[PDB]
Amino acid sequence: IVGGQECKDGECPWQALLINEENEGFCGGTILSEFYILTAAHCLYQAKRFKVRVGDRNTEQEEGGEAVHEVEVVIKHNRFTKETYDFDIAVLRLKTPITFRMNVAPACLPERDWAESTLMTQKTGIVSGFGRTHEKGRQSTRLKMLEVPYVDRNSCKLSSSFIITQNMFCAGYDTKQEDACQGDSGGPHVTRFKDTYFVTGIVSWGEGCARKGKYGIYTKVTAFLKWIDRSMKT
Amino acid sequence: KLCSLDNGDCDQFCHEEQNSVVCSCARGYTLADNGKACIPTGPYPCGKQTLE
Ligand SMILES: O=C(NCCNC(=O)c1ccc(Cl)s1)c1ccc(-n2ccccc2=O)cc1
């Protein structure tokens, strides 16, 4: 995350971190329930074997609220391709259920119609992660969160040198130096409504990070809600 | 206006069924007796920051 502020105690309980064999984070995810994690399909290619850690806010040192979970079933969308980064979504079923507690809780799955007319119509959404604080820097040892405005779909198609599919939406800033970044992929994009946060996106991609005239690109969760439910009932 | 009007006074989901507002809630919540508020059924309902 470039810019923004730290996630203070208990503010981003739905954040999940994918860790490789070296126990280092390479991507994020969103806790959907005790057995399921939502993430980006392109992240599965960033590591041979990985586990899911939850309840962490400072990777620098374990404190007592963290929990590592082994993945049982990896479910990637069969239509994802590295060529376009379309259908950049996947759901993970854990072998053991997550125990909810301080800093460990799920984000709500909204309904399609209401979400599109009411959540994605809001001014902003929240993106979080342990990603880089700058484009060419190192990954953050502290979990960060960033309020990002929803971006006009037309304006974003114009600024992107890559096709913006119906399964993607744009958020962020044109000039301000605040954006998601490398290492934040698969993480949550949630929108707040009356003190309740709903999953509205998955950190997907962006030309560099926080570059002027470029926005952050996220997978449109509302276009996969049926797929998500289906992937969770099996 | 219905749902267009302040989300039909709904806590969460709002639907217009037969020209009338109909509220619903995410999984883990129960629609209150007033048919508008959403009540959590457990200590860690989805969407709530753990601010203890
Ligand atoms: O890693 C890339 N960017 C650099 C790092 N910044 C981020 O990851 C960010 C992630 C999320 C936000 Cl939000 S900002 C990247 C990946 C894929 C694509 N890409 C798109 C379509 C098709 C082919 C393709 O290569 C472009 C650039």
Phi-psi region of B47 (alpha: psi -120 to 50; beta: other; left: phi over 0): left
Put simply, whether A198 touches B (Cβ < 8 Å) is yes
Q: Does the distance separating the beta carbons of A100 and B14 come in below 8 Å?
A: no
Give the span between the Cα atoms of B28 and A30, in whole angstroms: 17
Max CA distance (Å), chain B: 42
Burial A157-186 (b: 16+ CB within 10 A, else e): eebbeeebbebbbbbbbeeeebbbbbbbbb
Q: Which residue has the tokens 């044109």?
A: A174
Resolution (A): 1.9
Question: What tokens were used for A1?
Answer: 């995350």
A205, A212, A219, best to mutate for ligand 1 pocket (most atoms within 8 Å of CB): A205
CATH number assigned to the domain comprising residue B50: 2.10.25.10
Residue A27: φ, ψ to 5°: -160, 170
Number of domains in chain B: 1
Helix ranges (DSSP H) in chain A = 112-114, 153-159, 225-232
This structure was determined by X-ray
Q: Which atom of ligand 1 is nearest to the CA of A204?
A: 11
Q: Select from A108, A119, A120, A192 the residue whose CB has the most chain B CBs within 10 Å, as the one to mutate to test that interface.
A: A108
- Could you write out the DSSP letters of every residue in A7-58? --TTS-TTEEEEEETTS-EEEEEEE-SSSEEEE-GGGGGG-SSEEEEES-SB
Phi-psi region of A162 (alpha: psi -120 to 50; beta: other; left: phi over 0): beta
| Residue positions counted in chain A | 234
Query: Which domains, ranges and CATH numbers included, belong to chain A?
Result: 1-12+107-222 (2.40.10.10), 13-106+223-234 (2.40.10.10)
Domain hosting B40: range is 1-52
Give the span between the Cα atoms of A56 and A46, in whole angstroms: 21
Q: Which helix (H) or strand (E) holds B40?
A: strand B38-40
Give the span between the Cα atoms of A187 and A203, in whole angstroms: 5
Cα distances from A232 to residues A183, A184, A218, A225, in angstroms, run: 25, 23, 21, 10
Q: Select from B11, B24, B49 the residue whose CB has the most chain A CBs within 10 Å, as the one to mutate to test that interface.
A: B49
- Identify residue A18 by its one-letter amino acid code: L
Compare all CA atoms of chain A with the CA of B11 and give the residue at the minimum distance: A194
Q: Which helix (H) or strand (E) holds B31?
A: strand B29-31
Q: Does the distance separating the beta carbons of A106 and B14 come in below 8 Å?
A: no
Cα distances from B22 to residues A112, A136, A226, B38, B39, in angstroms, run: 16, 49, 21, 13, 16
